UniProtKB/Swiss-Prot annotation, chain A:
Protein name: Insulin A chain
Disulfide bonds: 6-11
Gene name in the database record: INS
Record organism: Homo sapiens
Domain of life from the UniProt record: Eukaryota
């Protein structure tokens, strides 16, 4: 999930946009 | 500003700024 990709590891714009509506 | 560790409310703030009018879903699981 997003916490594993963006909080416990370094986030990216690609990963954030995966969660946009 | 997105290429760092983003936790808690800082992650939700990043989604808000990046996604804009598209909205987003936050699922910490």
């Amino acid at each position: 999930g997003i916490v594993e990709q963006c909080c416990t590891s370094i986030c990216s714009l690609y990963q954030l946009e995966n969660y946009c509506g | 500003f997105v290429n760092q560790h983003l936790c808690g409310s800082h992650l939700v703030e990043a989604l808000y700024l990046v996604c804009g009018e598209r909205g987003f879903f936050y699922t910490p699981k």
